[PDB]
Amino acid sequence: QNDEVAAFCQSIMKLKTKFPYTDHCTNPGYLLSPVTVQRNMASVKVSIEIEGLQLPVTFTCDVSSTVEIIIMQALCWVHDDLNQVDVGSYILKVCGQEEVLQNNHCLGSHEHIQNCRKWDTEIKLQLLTLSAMCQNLARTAEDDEAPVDLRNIKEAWTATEQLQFTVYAAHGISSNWVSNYEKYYLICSLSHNGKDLFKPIQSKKVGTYKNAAYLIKWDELIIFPIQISQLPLESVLHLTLFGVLNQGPEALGKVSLTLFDFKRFLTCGTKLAYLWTSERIVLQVDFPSPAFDIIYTSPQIDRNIIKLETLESDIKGKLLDIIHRDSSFGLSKEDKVFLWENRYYCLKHPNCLPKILASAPNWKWANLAKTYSLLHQWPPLCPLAALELLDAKFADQEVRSLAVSWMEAISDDELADLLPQFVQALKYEIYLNSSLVRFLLSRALGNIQIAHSLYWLLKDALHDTHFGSRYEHVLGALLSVGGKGLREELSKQMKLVQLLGGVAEKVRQASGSTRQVVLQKSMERVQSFFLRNKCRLPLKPSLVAKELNIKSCSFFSSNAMPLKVTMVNADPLGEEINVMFKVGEDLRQDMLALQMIKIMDKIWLKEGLDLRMVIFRCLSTGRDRGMVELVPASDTLRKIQVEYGVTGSFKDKPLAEWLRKYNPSEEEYEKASENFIYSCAGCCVATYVLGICDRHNDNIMLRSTGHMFHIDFGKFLGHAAPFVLTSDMAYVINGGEKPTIRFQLFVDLCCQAYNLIRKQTNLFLNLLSLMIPSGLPELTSIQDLKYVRDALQPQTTDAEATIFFTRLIESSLGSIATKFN
Numbered sequence: 001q002n003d004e005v006a007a008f009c010q011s012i013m014k015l016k017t018k019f020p021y022t023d024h025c026t027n028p029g030y031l032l033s034p035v036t037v038q039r040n041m042a043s044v045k046v047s048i049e050i051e052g053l054q055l056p057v058t059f060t061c062d063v064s065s066t067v068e069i070i071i072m073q074a075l076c077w078v079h080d081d082l083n084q085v086d087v088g089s090y091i092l093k094v095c096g097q098e099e100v101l102q103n104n105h106c107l108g109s110h111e112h113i114q115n116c117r118k119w120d121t122e123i124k125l126q127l128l129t130l131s132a133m134c135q136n137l138a139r140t141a142e143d144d145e146a147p148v149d150l151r152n153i154k155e156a157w158t159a160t161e162q163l164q165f166t167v168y169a170a171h172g173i174s175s176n177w178v179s180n181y182e183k184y185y186l187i188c189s190l191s192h193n194g195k196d197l198f199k200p201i202q203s204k205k206v207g208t209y210k211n212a213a214y215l216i217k218w219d220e221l222i223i224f225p226i227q228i229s230q231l232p233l234e235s236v237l238h239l240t241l242f243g244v245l246n247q248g249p250e251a252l253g254k255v256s257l258t259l260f261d262f263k264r265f266l267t268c269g270t271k272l273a274y275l276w277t278s279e280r281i282v283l284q285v286d287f288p289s290p291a292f293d294i295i296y297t298s299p300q301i302d303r304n305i306i307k308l309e310t311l312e313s314d315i316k317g318k319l320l321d322i323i324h325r326d327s328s329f330g331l332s333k334e335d336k337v338f339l340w341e342n343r344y345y346c347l348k349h350p351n352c353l354p355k356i357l358a359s360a361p362n363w364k365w366a367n368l369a370k371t372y373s374l375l376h377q378w379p380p381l382c383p384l385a386a387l388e389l390l391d392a393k394f395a396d397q398e399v400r401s402l403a404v405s406w407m408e409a410i411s412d413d414e415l416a417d418l419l420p421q422f423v424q425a426l427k428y429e430i431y432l433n434s435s436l437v438r439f440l441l442s443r444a445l446g447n448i449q450i451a452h453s454l455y456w457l458l459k460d461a462l463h464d465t466h467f468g469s470r471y472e473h474v475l476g477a478l479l480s481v482g483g484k485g486l487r488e489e490l491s492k493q494m495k496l497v498q499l500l501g502g503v504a505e506k507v508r509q510a511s512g513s514t515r516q517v518v519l520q521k522s523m524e525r526v527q528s529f530f531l532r533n534k535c536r537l538p539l540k541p542s543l544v545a546k547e548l549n550i551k552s553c554s555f556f557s558s559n560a561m562p563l564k565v566t567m568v569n570a571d572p573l574g575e576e577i578n579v580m581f582k583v584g585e586d587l588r589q590d591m592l593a594l595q596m597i598k599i600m601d602k603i604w605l606k607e608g609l610d611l612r613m614v615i616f617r618c619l620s621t622g623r624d625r626g627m628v629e630l631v632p633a634s635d636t637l638r639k640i641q642v643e644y645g646v647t648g649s650f651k652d653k654p655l656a657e658w659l660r661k662y663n664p665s666e667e668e669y670e671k672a673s674e675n676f677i678y679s680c681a682g683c684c685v686a687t688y689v690l691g692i693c694d695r696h697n698d699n700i701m702l703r704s705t706g707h708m709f710h711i712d713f714g715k716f717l718g719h720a721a722p723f724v725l726t727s728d729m730a731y732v733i734n735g736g737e738k739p740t741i742r743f744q745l746f747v748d749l750c751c752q753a754y755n756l757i758r759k760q761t762n763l764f765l766n767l768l769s770l771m772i773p774s775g776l777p778e779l780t781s782i783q784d785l786k787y788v789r790d791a792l793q794p795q796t797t798d799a800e801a802t803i804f805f806t807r808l809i810e811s812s813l814g815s816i817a818t819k820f821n
């Protein structure tokens with residue numbers, strides 16, 4: 001490993017040379033305000049603070065205007081002609097946030113702008129020079145110049161020797177194990193493309209060695225029915241150890257060994273594998289040690305230029321029908337063989353290549369040359385299509401290297417929200433240095449939001465017992481390549497987390513009578529933290545916390561007694577920072593739900609549909625702890641049904657008369673009811689496809705502006721009414737007791753949104769598949785994907801699916817449904 005780690009480090013030094021501290025482009029030292037590209041890009045009021053004016057300039061801008069001309073519009077408000085001012089020196093930042101608007105994007109493209117439009121809040125920007133902008137994260141000269149720290153040959157295709165090895169012993173057995181388990185046995189599996197090449201082979205069952213209670217010795221020769229010549233390069237040996245109790249056999253751990261190392265030489269001699277439990281056991285497997293090294297050599301390059309062949313009508317449609325099929329998922333043995341033989345007819349449909357490689361007969365060394373020949377003349381995939389080619393199913397380095405090269409197309413703003421899936425895809429790279437990890441590190445270098453998100457994702461990946469060692473090295477490389485400025489702020493953030501994690505444990509372990517006092521006392525350590533530190537908020541590092549507002553800090557009076565942490569902004573131009581910190585629940589299930597809901601919002605906005613969706617952030621800092629964004633001026637349905645329940649018992653009125661008290665005027669209420677119609681549609685569609693079946697009045701939330709959203713994603717991909725519309729919901733939508741065209745608008749929005757997710761079925765299956773190895777309780781295998789596919793009714797028309805969802809809505813309405821048509 002020491003050799004692979006050395007070459008990785010020499011590769012990363014070479015990567016840093018492409019990102020000098022001089023280039024402001026890739027080394028800005030500030031976060032970029034995120035953008036999601038929205039169609040038809042309406043006007044807005046923006047408020048810009050200018051250097052030397054007592055009040056900010058407040059004017060109307062076209063949402064379609066680039067930030068560049070917005071900056072200049074703002075300069076025209078103080079300057080007559082702009083031949084005296086250097087406009088290229090100026091930037092716009094969000095007020096209270098170390099975030100810079102991207103010049104060449106529409107004002108309306110920016111996440112912050114469309115959030116302000118949703119809530120109807122003042123758009124407050126600040127105009128200033130690059131010179132004036134906080135750049136305390138930027139890489140220095142020191143950073144670039146600093147290092148990075150975290151005899152004969154026989155070609156394999158000629159090697160006819162049987163793959164065999166001796167499973168010798170495991171050393172360092174616990175006192176715990178000697179009591180429980182009588183004998184132990186290994187189950188040896190050979191795998192490539194995430195699938196077993198043969199039946200797994202079981203070791204003999206042996207106890208601890210005579211006069212040695214810490215050592216199990218098998219000294220057993222395992223022989224597979226395969227030759228080194230038949231081994232794919234990315235072939236992996238898996239050894240799962242089992243303890244048979246004395247007084248079913250029990251899985252104690254698993255090691256993986258790559259039969260070829262990162263230099264393509266076959267594993268030879270004694271190799272040591274470390275499997276963890278809580279404690280470190282050492283497994284010794286002895287490989288043959290011939291007089292000669294064996295090296296894997298790919299087949300010689302096959303140069304061909306294929307395009308006019310036999311064109312037959314009937315089968316041309318059965319190919320087109322398969323090409324245009326929703327996804328590769330569940331494709332029959334016959335459809336694979338048919339597509340495979342017609343693969344060279346599919347060169348004007350790039351995004352189907354994953355279906356072609358999934359329909360390969362095998363990955364035998366002989367047949368690789370003609371697969372490689374296809375790939376290198378194949379047209380570039382769209383980045384989201386190529387995600388599939390980084391999954392378990394495709395181990396081949398040429399396939400994955402191409403998949404990454406096509407991915408270079410993707411924007412930083414699109415990549416930002418896809419990172420969790422990319423981090424998990426590292427588990428399908430057998431080698432440490434790889435096209436993928438270099439892509440991720442390179443994107444983090446050139447963008448601070450990506451580096452920041454990678455840090456927290458990689459820190460969450462460490463806790464994996466099998467892949468913890470791999471992620472340790474990748475995090476190390478990120479932190480090293482990040483520079484001093486970044487590392488120090490990340491350390492500050494990591495400290496604030498541990499302290500808040502500390503306070504929340506202390507708060508919960510306290511009694512009901514003393515809990516409030518324990519919080520007030522426990523917050524002394526974070527009080528002290530801030531006296532010697534200004535710290536960026538981990539959930540949104542554009543927000544700088546200067547001080548803690550101790551009198552506003554509280555516990556939410558729920559199980560898990562979550563903290564409400566109120567913090568003062570280091571920017572007077574900014575607002576207070578309110579955020580939840582919770583301990584006990586694993587938040588990663590919630591993070592995925594929110595990710596999937598956020599990608600649906602992005603898909604809809606890319607086709608002109610805005611369903612006014614509430615998109616809040618959730619960060620898993622440690623195992624079973626993290627920060628959750630607090631949406632202001634919102635309450636659970638139940639709290640509202642309960643608070644109106646005291647005045648009247650009409651039951652149609654609670655939501656309606658709740659929205660009126662905050663939206664009193666006729667145009668104010670109508671808008672809030674419209675916000676509800678659009679937000680409810682998105683929520684209904686998201687509820688059904690993602691299979692969040694466990695919704696109730698404490699689960700559903702409602703913002704005072706009328707926007708509806710989910711919060712507790714306890715149930716996910718439920719399998720076994722999908723959503724529920726109550727009378728009070730129907731009342732707000734209709735605007736009265738009887739059905740209106742507003743309910744027809746609601747029905748159209750649902751069905752339209754539903755169809756736009758169906759056209760992206762493959763993306764949603766790829767995004768959930770890549771989160772299988774992350775070990776979430778409700779997502780362990782491809783069968784969990786089938787539900788979601790089955791919900792999206794593939795190979796049915798938009799018109800056929802509109803009737804299916806319309807009947808889901810009518811079904812949801814319950815007994816009131818009879819009143820509607």
Ligand SMILES: COc1ccc2c(nc(NC(=O)c3cccnc3)[n+]3cc[nH]c23)c1OC
Pocket residue numbers: 556580590616618628629630631632634635711712713
């Ligand atoms: C008054 O109580 C709340 C107002 C807003 C809240 C809010 N709670 C929120 N979060 C949650 O309920 C939650 C639970 C489990 C995993 N993720 C989020 N949450 C997320 C976004 N906004 C809000 C209030 O808490 C009851």
